[PDB]
Symmetry: D2
Amino acid sequence: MKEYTLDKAHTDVGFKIKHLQISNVKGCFKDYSAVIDFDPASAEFKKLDVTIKIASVNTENQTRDNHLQQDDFFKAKKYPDMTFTMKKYEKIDNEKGKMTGTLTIAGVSKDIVLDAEIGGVAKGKDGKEKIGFSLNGKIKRSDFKFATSTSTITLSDDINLNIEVEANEKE
Amino acid sequence: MKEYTLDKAHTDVGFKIKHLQISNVKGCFKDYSAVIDFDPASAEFKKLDVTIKIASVNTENQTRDNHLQQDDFFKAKKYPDMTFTMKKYEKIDNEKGKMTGTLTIAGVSKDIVLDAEIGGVAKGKDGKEKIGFSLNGKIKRSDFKFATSTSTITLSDDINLNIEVEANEKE
Amino acid sequence: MKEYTLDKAHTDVGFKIKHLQISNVKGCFKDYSAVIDFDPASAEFKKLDVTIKIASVNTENQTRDNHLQQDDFFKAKKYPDMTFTMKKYEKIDNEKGKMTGTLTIAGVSKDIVLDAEIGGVAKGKDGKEKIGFSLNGKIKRSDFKFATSTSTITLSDDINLNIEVEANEKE
Amino acid sequence: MKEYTLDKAHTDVGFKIKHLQISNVKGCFKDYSAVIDFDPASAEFKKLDVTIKIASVNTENQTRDNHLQQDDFFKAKKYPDMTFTMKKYEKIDNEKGKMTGTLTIAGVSKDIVLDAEIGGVAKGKDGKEKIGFSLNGKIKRSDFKFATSTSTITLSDDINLNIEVEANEKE
């Protein structure tokens, strides 16, 4: 038997413990097209049709973006683009209305409601029109059989859409 | 009715989705004392008794460390220190043995097994002894009624102990 | 050395593994009062004020109901009842409208939107009026600092309200 | 405007909220073979080699068992059986020892340690030998690239082995 004294400098009294952390993935699409018909006399949308290139996704992370394109997500090879087609705008007042339309994600289509909020209608610098509005709403991955392999525990079943639009008149 | 064209520069086609991520909290204690009795003739521990100042915790994060001291964790005001007392060392070979002892966390005591691995026995520069060994083992929060408020989902019930020791002879 | 043969009848080749499962808690309140003013000429609500006795909760489970009354949830001793007060009904059509009101949970108050769906307006058997409608909407625990101790991982931050009402005229 | 009174009998003041629950899957295998060489003079194992038919899994649930056989788990078509081969038994005392061996799950092989606990050595009714022992240890899914598609959040990375054996002498 012999007695020792720790060398505190090369001793580590250590532990490891596993925890969960919840976080929002925020993202946009860099490339999309839209057709916008709007009547400032009555603050009603007449036609709103959007096409989004799945390829142009951006969640501030290079390799998750690539991963989004694969079979367990978008299947961008087979289904390059997602689309929204307005079917009905039901006015609440000049600032607010309920928009109903058909969303299509990887070939599966469902009708969704978005909350339209008109953040501002104007005549621009040059005397030609502008508008600024938002579309907001929650859709469920499950309604679109989207990313079915991934559990609703790991990744939320709810996707929150925030479409923020500025837009100028045509020709 | 009037037709518009998105201004892609001030338009954001955006989404938010919640996901979970698992991660290890790694930590040590900066301040502890120990008594170490070891027989290099037989590579057996004879006495190993450790006291750790809960206050000296470090998980590379200032405000979690403070939080660790509160009621839902250590209760460092009431129970300033955690202690380990060896009761039995059962040798496997010169490199390996099973250590049994009493761990006390916030006044609750349980007997635990650690896996002793002797990483090296030597005579130092000055002809006085040194040893380097590790103690490893898993303990359960639940066995110590520790952090009972926190679910075993958020934070794992299993804590992994890694004690890495270098140590020199006495007097 | 000696050779043995398993007795398959008293041998168990076993394993244990921990998994997570997501589930909806569904619940109602057995005891509440309400004041309902509604104009069948225009299908507009005029006044809707509800008081719910927290005590009368029911989630098909005896001991969770008790637990709901405690500090980490409702605090029913201090705050026996939750209340809803309509501030505005904005009509969409005769079947649908957006209801805005003040919800109060344990003394904290926030304005919420519910989706009113009029499932049917009638003159009853006896020539006196009836109506059947639903109020639906999502509120966030966090907006009401509700059950703050419980993580948004264990229990969802989103509560989904489904108020299903049948109701007859007065005097 | 007109005033109504709830019909409490056909009114439901309801809510839905999502929570997580952690649970142990307990399971065994109904069909396996083993070779057991053991020396009661010294309480040492000499050879222990086990083959388990993945097909014979049982987790008290019909359709999860089927699911276990598929690509995201066992791949029982390609890899019908898992195997354990003892490489070393290191004795602690007559009741306890550390067993090291090669586990093979779906063609991937790793060396694992089990804790042998001899629950009893005897001469049976007929004067022929019996033994009762347990093998216990934790293995990591990740070490065997097992069920890689499933997150370590949904399903724990740690599998706990409990092999409980009764066994009689040969010929």
